[PDB]
Design a protein around this ligand. Sequence first.
Ligand code: C2E
Length: 164
Amino acid sequence: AATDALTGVANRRMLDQSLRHEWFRAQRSGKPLSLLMIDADHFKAFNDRHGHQAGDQALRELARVITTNVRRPADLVARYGGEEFSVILAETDSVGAQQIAEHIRAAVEQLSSVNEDQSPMTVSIGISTWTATSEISLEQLLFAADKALYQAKEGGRNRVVVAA
Ligand SMILES: Nc1nc2c(ncn2[C@@H]2O[C@@H]3COP(=O)(O)O[C@H]4[C@@H](O)[C@H](n5cnc6c(=O)[nH]c(N)nc65)O[C@@H]4COP(=O)(O)O[C@H]3[C@H]2O)c(=O)[nH]1
C-alpha cells in the first residue's frame, strides 16, 4: 500500500503525502527543499529491442542506483510513474542536489559497461529547489521540476537541468 511492487521504493501517493508534510516543515525550518524528476530515456525503444522483462529489470537497476545515492533520513525515493522516479531531498540546497543528480546520471550511463547483461541506457533529470526567501508554492515547486525534466528531454537526453 506504500511501496512499488516492482522496484521496492515508495509509490506515488506516498511521495505526494510525504512532500506535503516536508513542505510545511521547511516553511518553519527555512531549510532548502529540493526535488528530482528522473525519467528513463528512449524507454519505448528499449522495450522494443530487449522486451518487457529487460525494461522492468532496467527500472529496478535505476531504482537501485538512486537509492544508492539517496541515503539520508529526510529523503524519499518513489516510483512516480510507469517510467519516472521522483525523490525528495529535504534540507538539501540546489548545489548539493545537482551533485546527487550527476552521480545518478553517470552511474546509469555506466551500467552497461560494468555489467555485461545490462543494455546501454541513460536518464534525464530535472531539479527544482525551494529556499527560505522564495515565494513559490508546492505546486510551483513540482511544476518547475517536471518542466526542467522536459527541458532535459528537449535539449538532447542524458543530462541534468536545473529549473530557474
Ligand atoms: N539529502 C542528501 N544529500 C546528499 C546525499 N549524498 C550527498 N548529498 C549532497 O551532496 C553533497 C556532496 O556530498 P559528497 O560529495 O558525498 O561529500 C560529502 C560526504 O563525503 C561527507 N558526508 C557528509 N555526511 C555524511 C554521512 O552521513 N556519511 C558519510 N559516509 N559521509 C558523509 O561530507 C561531504 C559533504 O557533504 P555536504 O556538505 O552535506 O553536501 C553533500 C550533500 O548536500 C544524500 O544521501 N542525501
